[PDB]
Amino acid sequence: DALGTGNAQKQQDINHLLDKIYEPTKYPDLKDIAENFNPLGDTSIYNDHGAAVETLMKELNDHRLLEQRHWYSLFNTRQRKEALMLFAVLNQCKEWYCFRSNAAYFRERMNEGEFVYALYVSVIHSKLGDGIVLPPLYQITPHMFTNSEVIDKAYSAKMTQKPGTFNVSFTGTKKNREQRVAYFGEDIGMNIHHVTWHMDFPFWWEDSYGYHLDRKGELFFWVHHQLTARFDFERLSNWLDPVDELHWDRIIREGFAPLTSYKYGGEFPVRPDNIHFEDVDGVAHVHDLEITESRIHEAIDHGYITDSDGHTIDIRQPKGIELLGDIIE
Amino acid sequence: SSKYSSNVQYYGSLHNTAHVMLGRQGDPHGKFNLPPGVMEHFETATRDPSFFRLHKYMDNIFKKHTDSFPPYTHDNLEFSGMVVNGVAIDGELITFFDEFQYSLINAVDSGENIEDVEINARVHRLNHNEFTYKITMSNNNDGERLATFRIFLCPIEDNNGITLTLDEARWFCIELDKFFQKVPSGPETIERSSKDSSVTVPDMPSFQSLKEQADNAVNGGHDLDLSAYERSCGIPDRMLLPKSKPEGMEFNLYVAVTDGDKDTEGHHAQCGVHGEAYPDNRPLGYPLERRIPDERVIDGVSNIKHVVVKIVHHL
Ligand SMILES: *[C@H]1O[C@H](CO)[C@@H](O[C@@H]2O[C@H](CO)[C@@H](O)[C@H](O)[C@H]2NC(C)=O)[C@H](O)[C@H]1NC(C)=O
């Protein structure tokens, strides 16, 4: 800050914050902040009177938040909850003084993915983040977007201190699969949009956060219909045939080995091909889906979605397809 | 399992049973009394797709044996003296789809006093265009040696795109021609035709047409020398080359020329229909019938040369 704004400031601040992210920061201001600040002494910066801050401390305190240098999926109901607590502080800042402070204070003792994930969503949705452009995920946390080989090649570059660029590969045994329409899935661009798309309109949004995203519902319907078409075309251009729809009662015919690795975490598990779906402990039962899919499918077939009271809310009308997306994603 | 079997009570008859066995798959206990099926007949088996699934399986029972021999030596394929200088196709490899007409008459019953109306069937069949081989090549030997001209057309890449190996592809190649010629004592340039292939046969004369003709030499004195057709073992000339793509594919052409005097070291003899000793003595598919682990070798015998060709499909 300029005990405020700029943007080539706001901006600077951000680049510092997501610089070497798997290691304590090297930018000194970020550290005395990191040390000196107390998110709890002038609940005023906070439009909540700092209930959000006060909740994260509580957890950082009982030290019940996920550890640093460990992995993180946004599909973990707790990891998510923790990542999203950071979003609610950064969210209720009146100005840069409260953001930098917090993403500095926190950056330094909350885990990286919760952190990477909170800083981005926050920058994207909060009032205070206008001027900024976020660096591309692919360069901030490259392990999610580069291969496993280039990663190891880069680890060696570093061991030996001799530089240089390595050329990446493509997945399976090209000329042996349908890792022929790979160029599409594996692109750092689509992978970027896919993540952004869902940071722009998150599945977890409540309108307490501030405004309402408009038709995420159709927006969900549509974005995916697009990747599914866009995908189906590439498979056309490759003498391949449109894709199979998946069912829970059948084998997952087509499995792959991703060859990708986590930074802290191990390599991504692989899937053998012609496998039978198993009931996965913790998440949900396979049949649990099969019934979900029917409750779904009956709302489409009935003409109405029925809520909690047994109210039937009609969907044979234009808002239709969006109440369906709210129930389906 | 033919009658030359040494133990038929033990080894039975895989192939032939395998034809009846695939045919009643329509009715094995015979509850419906359906007739026999497309595979239980030779003029009709090539129709049903398992026909080729069933000969792929017979096919590698043989390769299992076929492959147990030790590979061939340099000294093995070498017909010292001769060397192929070059190989060229004088023309174009072009395949298209022609049209044919055979007659449906013996099919409908006409009894009597009722007269014959000429009914016909028109089919669509493949074709290619005549082309010529110009095989340029020197006999370093002192003078004139007999030669087996062997010509295979093997593939090159996978359909995965992959690009196989003369081990991966030695087995997949089909013979296009095999003929015996003498080689001069110096640089000749043999040229030879789509049309003279030894594995091919022309379409045959119509039924009628051989009636017309038979009849005319009866009321006329004598002849019928159409010897052109009293055996014809081969495949259709139309089927000489494969169909390929309209973009074109490049196949690999192998001309290996082996030594006539040892080949025919003893003797139609093409369709030995009547007892006639097959004339070539090399085993069959020579010399691609054996594991060829290092190509390193086929490559350094003077009398084997490979060149790529390209076939195109007219729409
Ligand atoms: C990775 O592919 C690139 C293509 O960008 C190759 O980099 C080339 O290096 C060659 C050396 O053979 C040069 O002739 C090209 O000018 C290079 N281009 C950049 C069109 O560097 C590279 O060879 C590949 N492999 C490494 C086996 O980097």
CA B49–ligand 1 middle distance (angstroms): 47
Long-range contacts of A227-232 (CB under 8 A, 24+ apart): A227/A190, A227/A194, A230/A184, A231/A181, A231/A184, A231/A185
Whether the Cβ atoms of residue B190 and residue B135 lie closer than 8 Å to each other: yes
CA distance A280 to A283: 6
What interhelical angle do A28-36 and A96-105 show, nearest 10? 80
For residue A177, the chain B residue with the least C-alpha distance is B160
CA distance B185 to B147: 12
CA A183–ligand 1 middle distance (angstroms): 19
Q: List every span in chain A annotated with CATH 1.10.1280.10.
A: 170-329
Give A-chain residues touching B161 at CB under 8 angstroms. 175
Any idea of the CA torsion for A240, A253, B53, B313, to the nearest 10 degrees? 0
Whether the Cβ atoms of residue A175 and residue B160 lie closer than 8 Å to each other: yes
Give B-chain residues touching A175 at CB under 8 angstroms. 158, 160-162
Q: Which fold has domain B69-98+126-203+223-315?
A: Immunoglobulin-like (2.60.40)
Region at A266 (left for phi over 0; alpha for psi -120 to 50; beta for the rest)? left
For residue A174, the chain B residue with the least C-alpha distance is B160
For residue A176, the chain B residue with the least C-alpha distance is B160
Q: Which residue has the tokens 């499909």?
A: B313
CA distances from A70 to A102, A114, A147, A322 (A): 21, 10, 19, 37
Q: How many CB atoms lie within 10 A of CB A50?
A: 21
CA A131–ligand 1 middle distance (angstroms): 38
Helix (H, G, I), strand (E, B), or coil: what is residue A206?
Answer: coil
Q: Which of A52, A51, A58, A39 is nearest to A98 (CA)?
A: A39
Give A-chain residues touching B160 at CB under 8 angstroms. 175-177
For residue A175, the chain B residue with the least C-alpha distance is B160
CA distance A29 to A39: 16
CA distance A255 to A271: 5
Q: Quick check: bond before A202 cis, omega within 30?
A: no
Q: Which of B153, B157, B160 is nearest to B176 (CA)?
A: B153
Resolution stated for this PDB structure, in Å: 3.2
**Homologous superfamily in CATH for domain A170-329:** Di-copper center containing domain from catechol oxidase (1.10.1280.10)
B41 is in an annotated binding site: no
Q: How far is B154 from chain A (nearest CA, A)?
A: 20
Q: How far is A267 from chain B (nearest CA, A)?
A: 28
CA A175–ligand 1 middle distance (angstroms): 22
Whether the Cβ atoms of residue A109 and residue A123 lie closer than 8 Å to each other: no
Contacting B residues, span 217-256, partner chain A, CB-CB under 8 Å: none
CA distance A118 to A111: 10
Q: Which residue has the tokens 């005549």?
A: B130
Flag whether residue B159 sits within 8 Å of chain A, measured between CB atoms. no
CA distances from B141 to A61, A266, A303, B84 (A): 96, 68, 91, 13
Give B-chain residues touching A177 at CB under 8 angstroms. 160
HSE-CB for B212 with a 13 A CA cutoff = 5
What interhelical angle do A10-17 and A96-105 show, nearest 10? 10
For residue A180, the chain B residue with the least C-alpha distance is B160
- End-to-end CA separation in angstroms for chain B: 43
Whether the Cβ atoms of residue B198 and residue B179 lie closer than 8 Å to each other: yes
Q: How many CB atoms lie within 10 A of CB A17?
A: 20
Whether the Cβ atoms of residue A90 and residue A119 lie closer than 8 Å to each other: yes
Q: How far is A251 from chain B (nearest CA, A)?
A: 24
Give B-chain residues touching A176 at CB under 8 angstroms. 160, 162
CA distance A19 to A6: 20
Token code pair at residue A133: 């452009």
Q: Which residues of B131-152 are buried (b: 16+ CB within 10 A; e: fewer)?
A: bebebebbbeeeeebbbbbbbb
Give A-chain residues touching B165 at CB under 8 angstroms. none
Optimal mutation site among B162, B165, B245, interface A, most CBs of chain A within 10 A: B162
CA distance A190 to A197: 10
> Please, what sign has the CA dihedral across residues B163, B167, B169, B170?
positive
Optimal mutation site among B159, B160, B165, B168, interface A, most CBs of chain A within 10 A: B160
Q: Which residues of B4-15 are buried (b: 16+ CB within 10 A; e: fewer)?
A: eeeeeeeeeeee
Residues making up the annotated binding site of A for Cu cation are 194, 198, 224
CA distance B64 to B53: 17
B15 is in an annotated binding site: yes
Burial class (CB in 10 A: 0-12, 13-18, 19+), A219: middle
Q: Which residues of A138-174 are buried (b: 16+ CB within 10 A; e: fewer)?
A: eebebbbbbbeeebebbeeeeeeeeeeeeeeeebeee
CA A153–ligand 1 middle distance (angstroms): 16
Name the E strands within chain A. Answer: 251-252, 275-276, 304-306, 312-314
Q: Which helix (H) or strand (E) holds B121?
A: strand B120-123
User: CB-based contacts of A173: which residues, under 8 Å, 6+ apart?
Assistant: A179
Optimal mutation site among A173, A175, A181, interface B, most CBs of chain B within 10 A: A175
Q: How far is A173 from chain B (nearest CA, A)?
A: 10
Q: What are phi and psi of B256, to 5 degrees?
A: -120, 135
User: CB-based contacts of A76: which residues, under 8 Å, 6+ apart?
Assistant: none
Q: How far is A149 from chain B (nearest CA, A)?
A: 23
Q: How far is B163 from chain A (nearest CA, A)?
A: 10
